[PDB]
Amino acid sequence: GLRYGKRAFVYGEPPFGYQDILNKLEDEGFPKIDYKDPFFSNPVDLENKPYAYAGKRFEISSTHVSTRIPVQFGGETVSVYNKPTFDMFSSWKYALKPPTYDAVQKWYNKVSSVHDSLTHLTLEIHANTRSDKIPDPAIDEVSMIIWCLEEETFPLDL
Amino acid sequence: MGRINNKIDDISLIGRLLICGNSVDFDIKSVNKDELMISLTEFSKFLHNILPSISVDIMPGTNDPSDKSLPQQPFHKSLFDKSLESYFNGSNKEILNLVTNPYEFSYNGVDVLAVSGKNINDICKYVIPSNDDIEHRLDLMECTMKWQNIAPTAPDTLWCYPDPFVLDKWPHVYIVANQPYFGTRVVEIGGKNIKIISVPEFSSTGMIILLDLETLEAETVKIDI
Amino acid sequence: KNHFMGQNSIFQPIKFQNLTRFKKICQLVKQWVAETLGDGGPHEKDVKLFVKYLIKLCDSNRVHLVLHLSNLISRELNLCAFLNQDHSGFQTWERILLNDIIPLLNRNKHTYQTVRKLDMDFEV
Amino acid sequence: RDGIPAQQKIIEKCIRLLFQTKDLSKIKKYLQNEFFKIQIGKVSAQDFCFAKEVKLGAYKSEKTAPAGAVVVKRRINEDHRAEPQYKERIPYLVVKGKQGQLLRERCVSPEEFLEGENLELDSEYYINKILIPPLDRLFNLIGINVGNWAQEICGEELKICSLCDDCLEKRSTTTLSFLIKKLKRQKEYQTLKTVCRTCSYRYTSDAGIENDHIASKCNSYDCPVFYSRVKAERYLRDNQSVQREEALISLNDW
Amino acid sequence: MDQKASYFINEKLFTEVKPVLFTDLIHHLKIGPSMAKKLMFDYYKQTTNAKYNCVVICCYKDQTIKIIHDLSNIPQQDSIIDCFIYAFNPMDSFIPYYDIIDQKDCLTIKNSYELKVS
Amino acid sequence: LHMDALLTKFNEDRSLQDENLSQPRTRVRIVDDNLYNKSNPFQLC
Amino acid sequence: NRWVEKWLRVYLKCYINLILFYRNVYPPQSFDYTTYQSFNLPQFVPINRHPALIDYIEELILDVLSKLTHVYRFSICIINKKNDLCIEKYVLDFSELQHVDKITETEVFDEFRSSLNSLIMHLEKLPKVNDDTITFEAVINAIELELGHKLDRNRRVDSLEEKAEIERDSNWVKCQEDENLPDNNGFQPPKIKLTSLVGSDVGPLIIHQFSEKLISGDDKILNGVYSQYE
Amino acid sequence: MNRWVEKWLRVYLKCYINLILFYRNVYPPQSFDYTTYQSFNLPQFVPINRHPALIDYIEELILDVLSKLTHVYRFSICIINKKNDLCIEKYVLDFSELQIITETEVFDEFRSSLNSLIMHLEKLPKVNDDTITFEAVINAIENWVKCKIKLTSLVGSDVGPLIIHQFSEKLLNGVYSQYSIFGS
DNA sequence: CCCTCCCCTAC
Ligand code: SF4
């Protein structure tokens, strides 16, 4: 393995482990899995208003970097109070990583001789109505009748 | 213009140039006015660079911005660059004329019938289990001529009217555009001679047809890359 | 815009012979080198002015422009060969474009902040 | 089944988005887009119809009769043979009406709504009374209200104001846009007609003439293709199409 | 005619990176296509710097215009009736650009129909 | 044959004739009798 | 300030797309030769069809153009995926840019076409690059601006413009000149190669262009990224 | 001068340790808080462990390290394979600073260093669960107990007296298995 | 603002 060094001091072993950390955290009073509550993709929809209903207060925060609280050491947040002092001839580099070659390539690649039933008969009619008044059993006569016996369960093969 | 072949006498025999349609191809489902304007400006640049040398006749196409019905009206007085204002003054139409999709060009006393080809593509898209090759297309053209109509499939080709497609005089030469294959044939129906020419598309296998009016002969010129 | 440009633009271009545009001065240099070949040799004052302009141009960390000018001069000399060769104008121009330019390329490797790492021999 | 298919689809999509992405911004954007589409009128007009069964003989009085009972009685008045069976759903729509008008007063039947030349659905009434209550009930448990999202949302073209109803000429662009719109509408109508002809081929058994007429004779209200064809025909025959043609003629008069 | 068309080609090829066609010389010096083709043939030689990719077309007996791409095996050697340099390309890709050219008097074939305004 | 051989066989022996460009040859006059005849059956309003 | 920004955005988009296509940063199959990319491109610049890549490129171009007043040099950095070494540096020098708040389209597009043609001529002569073994970055050089310090006021966004500004302010990190280059080991030290290219010189837009190439190494540099000899 | 250095070094060390812990499998995912915390205004998500005991232990270790900052030459975090007791990976933060410098320069330098560390950790291969443990080691210049390489250099703070250099080294029996850590 | 009638669903 890799040598620690010519003169290296080793620290104490971590109090927790890979499997006992979740159990200890659950015993401490917090849920094992912190499922993410509904949020806002952009803080423009936050509206900076208290979210409550029927006297129950709801805390909604966005995942955008604008509303994310700074990392705090010892329970106290750290931030810059003095105004920034920009110098002359300063170079800058983009932060967001571009899409990978593999992702683009993958995206391009994809894009009984016994009667045990009941005989059945079906009937339908056609009536020659006058103008648009639908069929009438008093002034309209039947012009066509269509029947179709169900051959699946019809015996005797006549 | 005779710049390539250098044969001035042979090139000068081409009195007129006839564009049969499909100048610009686009999908109407998802298209913006900017790209169509760019394509139309390129076409206008070509026209302005070729109009002084030779007369150009513009015909509507299936995919061009024109009416989807077979009797397509001419393109427009607009949709061209400002350099064509002199050509579009209205008095000078003999060198730049826009006609309807079906027309009878009486070129030097010879009446020829030219269509974009939507009718043939309409019958081709149908499957008839009783009868896509050059010979099959020519037989289809023969049947179309014999039936004395231009669009046998009326619902697919045209929509209502505001019937011109019923032939009243047989043209000397039949011209149909937007066909995968080029073929020529002389026919004799009822003692009358009719020539059928199917000019192919220029985007793929971009060959053109030179129709000689004196001998009724058609020759093909192939352009590669 | 924010009282930091220091000139009409963000940077002050080097002006030679009352010329500002880079393409304009490049065309002027091409015209000068084309007409000077038939004269038997450029004037000493013009060469001194060109050298001063080049050294001022380098001092402002614009070595790309110097490389472009050297490439233009070399291309003009190459394309003037076989037609303007051995008439006492090509030899002196080549000697000047070597001695007063090629050593001048690898000087003042500045980028407004310390010195650029490694070195460069230039395509030239 | 007391609502409409559109509200069911909207609720299902919102619930799925909330359960999967857990991002209320996406839900808000989708709701705003749906509300804008409803207000504009680009809807199928088939998912905005109600389906409630009506019992003619089980109503205490005409005042207490349901909304569908009014439509049933109106259809019975013009023809006594159109008597629905017991517990039979009767489709109906709610068109726009004057302020203070009762919901049962309008009771626009789909047959009357589609045949109506100047009948417009009550976009505001639908958007409020069919979406705000259920979405609020499904979302107030989180701490947000859908009412705020809903409330936050002369001239051929949209110059504020301007004959041809166009201040800036821009002929080469205006005629191109008009041609593009007309071509898109014509292509959609042709595709719809082809689909209807193919569907009617089942009975006609012919793909030529006298089958397209039969295909156009179809008026089935259970198929969205019929509603789309009706909308396309209305768009083609609308006054806006005449205005576009007049503007094209005026611009091409040079 | 020499020392001017050559200079124009040199400028259009190196001062600004753009492929040049013979039609450009027809527009520039108002000379016939044969003279422009002879000028391209003259410029093809006596050039030590091979910084351009010449484009040569082939005019067949059947007027089959073809662009030469392999420059090694051209089919129908005996069927070619004309051969000249179409254009000078500073890179492999051609992608020419076309604009408005004022062909006031550079036409070699003039249509019998004239132009009238108002 | 190589490309250079074809180039020196064809382009070198250029005719350089009938290219005065001062009096260009007139194109064949082809007229359209229906250009001003109108009465187009396929013309719609 | 209206037409100039549009032309600059179009030129930057074409520059980035050509650089990505010709350096094999992304597969050539995704790239398609086209003229319309919602703007009138000067030539048939190959534009990738990946929606995420298109959005990323558009956002990068917009962010660069937003701070173009304080930016005098824009560069595209090509770095190996395996080891963080810059093997190619392409710089779009904005010497003056003629920043005026007060030329048509033909001349500007002609200058852009000439610049892109020169860039293509430079790019074809370069050796081929292996697949899925290269990455590109964006490094800009500024004169007077501080990035990432705008989030110290706990500002709450109320409009899209201010949210975009606060996002662009914190989207850049401070770096140093000649950072990703080799550290001059001394055993046959690498010598960077400088190549000069012509730039657009329109009346409103003045642009200079040049490129950087390692063209050297001391082992473990340019290894298996240049497709062997060819 | 040194006040700003220590104040920002505390946060930088905490963020670096948390990122190293989360991006590797010393502790399981979905046990951190990557949604409601920002390290140095970076767009990337910085995870912080939800367990108060682990955070307190990390803070105590950082404070103890900074107490003897003048006596430590190298500080590193080890990746140890279980049942092997070998340092698979080591992330070393070299110290060469000498005990003026403005606060914003230090802030920007630490931001760039954290960005480089996050970018380097993003492309690291996936590692199986319940197989890796971590340990903090310091090197004395000239509680605590007495004690093939693939070096990858990272950009450190060099804006003045701070000369902190960041680099990592790599190279197990089938522990590394190829498999988007923020998707769960 | 609350009651009554109608509609619909879940166990
Ligand atoms: S409407 Fe629906 S059903 Fe009636 S024809 Fe067209 S498709 Fe077939």
Side-chain angles (χ1 to χ4, degrees), chain G residues 88-94 98-100 105-106:
Chain G
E88 282 181 67
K89 194 166 114 77
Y90 302 89
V91 179
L92 250 178
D93 173 352
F94 298 150
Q98 284 297 136
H99 264 306
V100 280
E105 171 156 280
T106 38

Side-chain angles (χ1 to χ4, degrees), chain C residues 2 4-6 9-11 13 20-23 25 27-29 31-34 37-38 40-42 47 49-54 57-66 68-69 71-73 75 78-81 84-85 87 89-90 92-93 101 103-107 111-112 115-118 122 124:
Chain C
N2 307 90
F4 80 99
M5 310 273 201
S9 296
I10 176 172
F11 264 121
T20 294
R21 207 80 59 161
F22 187 59
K23 288 303 198 52
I25 189 174
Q27 296 255 10
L28 167 64
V29 164
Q31 147 82 36
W32 165 37
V33 69
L37 281 153
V47 180
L49 284 173
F50 197 47
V51 152
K52 204 182 321 293
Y53 166 64
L54 256 198
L57 180 42
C58 268
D59 284 354
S60 165
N61 157 64
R62 314 256 173 90
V63 76
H64 44 295
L65 305 191
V66 181
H68 180 251
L69 274 170
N71 260 348
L72 171 89
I73 295 160
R75 194 161 31 61
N78 165 327
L79 294 197
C80 271
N84 316 63
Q85 268 202 231
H87 319 120
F90 180 83
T92 166
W93 244 119
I101 301 185
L104 207 68
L105 279 162
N106 224 327
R107 274 61 161 281
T111 170
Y112 312 107
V115 47
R116 290 211 32 94
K117 200 168 51 153
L118 318 99
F122 299 152
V124 74

